[PDB]
């Protein structure tokens, strides 16, 4: 289950202000490679990772025409939703869209995805069989019947089984130097005295890729889950990620605490002390 | 690359 490709659309109506804003973003695994914003001077699908820049002008044109046209689609879908739910044309609303493929280490499809949201809540979702839909409510139920009759699933299944898989394989090959070489975390432990009796030990994981990581504290080799303060994994800004884990420990007793780091880029799980 | 629908996913 090594890899994935993902596209995310956000369509935000803003009555009073201009036409609804449309933003699209594309990812391979935890790397953003592509970007579109209907608010820009001249809206274009634009690169966000070194390895996509090598696609020629017709890739960029085709992707741009798609996004402009997808904008129109969701711009209209906002108005339909407005009617299905009987909402004021003065209110601002948001449609979100997700789709993409998962592949195993072999490059073969594991599953595809296509989900839509309205104002932050599930709306309709393609089932894992890529043949049927699950509506979240009675408004989405009308869509399901429209999409069933228009056989909208057929094209999605074709994309996800085919083009999604093949372009992802292409991208993983072109970007192999960065996409397929896991960067292990740089780890250190810091000491912060909070009184005479107690200090915080903070275990740091820095500059790692991909985002998935496990940090745990042990005392005398036994787990310390209830007592561990974990922060959410956060972007460094340079396409890598950071996380830390902390535990409050009595003075002098620091050597009994060990931090444990698991990440796909480490040959073996780390064990760290202060 | 992005999905390019033949048939609009119209609500």
């Amino acid at each position, epitope marked *: 289950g090594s890899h994935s490709m993902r596209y995310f659309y956000t369509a935000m109506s803003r009555p009073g202000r201009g036409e609804p804003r449309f933003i699209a973003v594309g990812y391979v695994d935890d790397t953003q490679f592509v970007r579109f914003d209907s608010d820009a001077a001249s809206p274009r699908m634009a690169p966000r990772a070194p390895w996509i820049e090598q696609e020629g002008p017709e890739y960029w044109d085709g992707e741009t025409r798609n996004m402009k046209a997808s904008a129109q689609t969701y711009r209209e879908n906002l108005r339909i939703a407005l009617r299905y739910y009987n909402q004021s044309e003065a209110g601002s609303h948001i449609i979100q869209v997700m789709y993409g493929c998962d592949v195993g280490p072999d490059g073969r499809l594991l599953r595809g995805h296509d989900q839509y949201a309205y104002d932050g809540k599930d709306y309709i979702a393609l089932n894992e069989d890529l043949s049927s839909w699950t509506a979240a409510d009675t408004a989405a139920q009308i869509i399901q019947r429209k999409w069933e009759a228009a056989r909208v699933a057929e094209q999605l299944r*074709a994309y996800l089984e085919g083009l999604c898989v093949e372009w992802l394989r292409r991208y993983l090959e072109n970007g192999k130097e960065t996409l397929q070489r896991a960067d292990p975390p740089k780890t250190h432990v810091t000491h912060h005295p909070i009184s005479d009796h107690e200090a915080t030990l903070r275990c740091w994981a820095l500059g790692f890729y991909p985002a998935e990581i496990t940090l745990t504290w042990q005392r005398d080799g036994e787990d310390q889950t209830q007592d561990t303060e974990l922060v959410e994994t956060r972007p460094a800004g340079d396409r890598t990620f950071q996380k830390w884990a902390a535990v409050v420990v009595p003075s002098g007793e620091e050597q009994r605490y060990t931090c444990h780091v698991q990440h796909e880029g480490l040959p073996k799980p780390l064990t760290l002390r202060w | 690359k992005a999905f390019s*629908p*033949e048939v609009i996913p119209m609500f």
Partner: T-cell receptor
Amino acid sequence: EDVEQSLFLSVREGDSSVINCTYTDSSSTYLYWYKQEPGAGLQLLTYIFSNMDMKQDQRLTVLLNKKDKHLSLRIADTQTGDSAIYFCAVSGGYQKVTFGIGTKLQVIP
Amino acid sequence: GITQSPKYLFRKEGQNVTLSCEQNLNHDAMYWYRQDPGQGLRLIYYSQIVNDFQKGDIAEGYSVSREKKESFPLTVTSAQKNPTAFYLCASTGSYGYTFGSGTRLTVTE
């Protein structure tokens, strides 16, 4: 986009006819065949996604060679009523389709 | 599903004429094409939804409107020095196009 098909084509009734099409663009992921009686409208016969090697419906078989950007339509056991103009068409999406010029098929009884 | 009437139309050079196209299929998108010998199908105008019309590839001298669903009337002005063609009205709901049976316009000197 540029789609080319033979003007061509005359077969004996009962034989099998094949009509050919090529297109130039890799973005053409939706591929179609239509037929038209002269003086009337196009009628949709088949569609296929670039995903698929082949598709079959009764007497009709469509093969696609994505590598060769080559689309073909096979009509099994042609009849008199099969005589018509056949159009392949291709789209990259949004029904922004390019039609070929059409292949006139004559079925000799 | 789609009806175009009348089947034939005749007009003197330099005179406006509106062609009729009606549908009972409840499709959102409708299209106008022309067909000429030694040429396939050239788009003129299209409408993905009521109150919205976009120029096709060859709109020089054409105008359309969409005020209701159901209907998409094309108007031919003193457009080109060649408004004589076969005109086909079309709509989309699912993969591919549904076509009307077409109208022949002959414009004479």
